[PDB]
Amino acid sequence: LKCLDGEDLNQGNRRRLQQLQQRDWIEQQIREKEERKRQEDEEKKAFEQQTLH
Amino acid sequence: MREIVHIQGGQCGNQIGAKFWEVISDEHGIDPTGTYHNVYYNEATGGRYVPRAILMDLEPGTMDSVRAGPFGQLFRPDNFVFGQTGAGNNWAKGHYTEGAELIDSVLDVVRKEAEGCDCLQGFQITHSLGGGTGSGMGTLLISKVREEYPDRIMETFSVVPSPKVSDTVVEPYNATLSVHQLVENADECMVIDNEALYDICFRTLKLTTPTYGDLNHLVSAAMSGVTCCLRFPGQLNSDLRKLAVNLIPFPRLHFFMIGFAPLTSRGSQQYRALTVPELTQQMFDAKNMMCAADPRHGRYLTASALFRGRMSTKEVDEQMLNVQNKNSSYFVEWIPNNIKSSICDIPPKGLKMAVTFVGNSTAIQEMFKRVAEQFTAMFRRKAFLHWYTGEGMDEMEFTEAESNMNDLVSEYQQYQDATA
Numbered sequence: 001l002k003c004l005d006g007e008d009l010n011q012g013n014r015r016r017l018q019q020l021q022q023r024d025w026i027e028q029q030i031r032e033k034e035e036r037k038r039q040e041d042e043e044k045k046a047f048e049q050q051t052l053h
Numbered sequence: 054m055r056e057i058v059h060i061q062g063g064q065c066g067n068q069i070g071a072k073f074w075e076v077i078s079d080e081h082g083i084d085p086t087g088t089y090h091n092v093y094y095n096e097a098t099g100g101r102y103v104p105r106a107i108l109m110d111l112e113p114g115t116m117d118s119v120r121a122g123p124f125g126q127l128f129r130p131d132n133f134v135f136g137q138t139g140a141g142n143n144w145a146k147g148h149y150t151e152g153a154e155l156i157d158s159v160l161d162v163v164r165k166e167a168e169g170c171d172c173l174q175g176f177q178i179t180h181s182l183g184g185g186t187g188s189g190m191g192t193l194l195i196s197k198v199r200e201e202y203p204d205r206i207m208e209t210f211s212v213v214p215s216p217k218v219s220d221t222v223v224e225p226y227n228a229t230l231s232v233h234q235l236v237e238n239a240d241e242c243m244v245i246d247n248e249a250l251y252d253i254c255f256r257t258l259k260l261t262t263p264t265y266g267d268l269n270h271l272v273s274a275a276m277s278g279v280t281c282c283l284r285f286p287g288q289l290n291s292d293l294r295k296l297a298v299n300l301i302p303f304p305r306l307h308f309f310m311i312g313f314a315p316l317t318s319r320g321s322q323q324y325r326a327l328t329v330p331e332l333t334q335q336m337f338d339a340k341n342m343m344c345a346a347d348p349r350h351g352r353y354l355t356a357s358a359l360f361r362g363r364m365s366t367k368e369v370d371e372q373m374l375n376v377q378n379k380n381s382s383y384f385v386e387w388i389p390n391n392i393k394s395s396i397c398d399i400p401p402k403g404l405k406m407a408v409t410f411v412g413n414s415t416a417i418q419e420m421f422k423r424v425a426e427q428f429t430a431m432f433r434r435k436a437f438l439h440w441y442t443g444e445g446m447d448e449m450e451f452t453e454a455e456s457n458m459n460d461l462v463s464e465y466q467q468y469q470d471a472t473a
């Protein structure tokens with residue numbers, strides 16, 4: 001009982017690793033969202049061209 | 054956000070509006086096809102930019118012209134509400150007879166224009182005061198919409214009659230009627246007059262063949278500069294209301310004067326330097342403004358100056374304070390620092406600095422004295438009245454109208470004498 005591994009010694013590692021993972025996922029989601037938005041805009045432009053014709 | 058509905062009207066209104074939308078299309082880089090190559094324009098399919106504006110006249114003439122000239126494709130044909138009977142230089146004809154027959158559709162389209170906005174700030178008008186169509190229709194529209202929209206402000210870029218040689222002979226009647234109307238339901242009667250424009254074009258641009266194109270372009274430049282420090286980034290921003298609050302100490306005292314700077318010929322352009330001292334020299338000279346009231350024969354209740362250009366700031370304020378504390382006689386005393394300033398960050402197309410100088414002065418009392426005098430001389434003989442009574446109107450209004458006119462100047466002169 002002199003030492004209990006139930007305390008978190010490497011809290012810094014947990015924190016930094018979670019930060020990096022969160023940044024990675026945020027980047028992926030930002031990219032896919034921008035892609036979706038641009039696709040929606042191009043579809044709207046397509047309907048614009050159909051109506052003009 | 055903070056949009057603006059432009060209301061044309063009358064022949065002068067239509068021409069000046071065509072020129073104004075031309076200047077705006079120039080500044081915002083819009084070619085006359087309608088594409089780009091929200092404060093004024095509305096977006097439409099395919100990136101098209103349709104101007105948020107409405108034209109009107111009891112005659113389809115000037116409408117046909119502006120639809121035939123350049124930038125005639127911009128304005129949508131739903132906003133060309135136009136009657137075909139004509140008004141004909143009779144204010145009553147365009148304010149009591151045909152007013153009730155077209156104002157319905159005009160209010161319909163103006164409502165469909167305002168509700169289509171999100172947060173409207175104010176209105177802005179371009180019309181004359183003598184021509185029946187312009188004065189009558191425009192002031193009736195202003196009455197209706199101001200009794201409709203109470204919180205937002207008005208703006209009447211109104212061309213008063215020239216002093217010496219009129220354009221119409223029954224001008225003073227329509228002038229006094231329109232100025233008794235607009236003094237009650239409008240916040241800025243920014244007056245413009247042609248003879249001062251002629252003097253400018255002969256004295257500060259050397260164009261010896263002054264055509265209405267150039268005069269309209271000049272007033273267009275002034276009109277654009279009025280609000281430029283809003284739709285652009287700014288070191289110290291402004292709007293249509295910061296002016297309106299730094300300008301009128303009392304709601305009746307809301308008849309301004311306008312001035313634009315700098316103005317140079319082609320020859321002078323190479324040599325004349327462009328720094329804020331000479332811009333100030335220009336903007337504070339008598340022969341440089343657009344009003345038939347010598348600013349050196351009155352005073353300034355207040356005067357604001359919208360600058361444009363990436364220039365210094367301390368020198369602006371220093372020159373303002375110098376111009377004030379030097380001619381403290383030519384300014385009024387009981388108010389401190391009667392000169393307000395503002396600065397944007399983008400100069401117009403073709404220059405690097407620009408000053409729109411607007412001023413709530415008390416020199417225009419000469420103009421209103423002249424108009425009232427012409428009214429007396431043409432009324433005390435019942436002249437030209439059998440028209441303004443055959444259209445459902447008794448002389449009473451006129452007298453009381455003129456009566457109100459008197460009170461107006463009766464305040465101006467008064468405040469030019471108080472000292473404390």
Ligand SMILES: Nc1nc2c(ncn2[C@@H]2O[C@H](COP(=O)(O)OP(=O)(O)O)[C@@H](O)[C@H]2O)c(=O)[nH]1
Pocket residue numbers: 062063064065066068069110140141142181182183184185186187188212220221247265268269
């Ligand atoms: N600065 C300027 N003023 C104009 C111009 N055209 C007309 N005006 C004035 O417009 C006034 C005529 O008013 P308006 O109602 O439009 O004429 P109407 O349609 O025949 O009744 C006249 O007093 C003209 O002086 C222009 O092109 N430039």
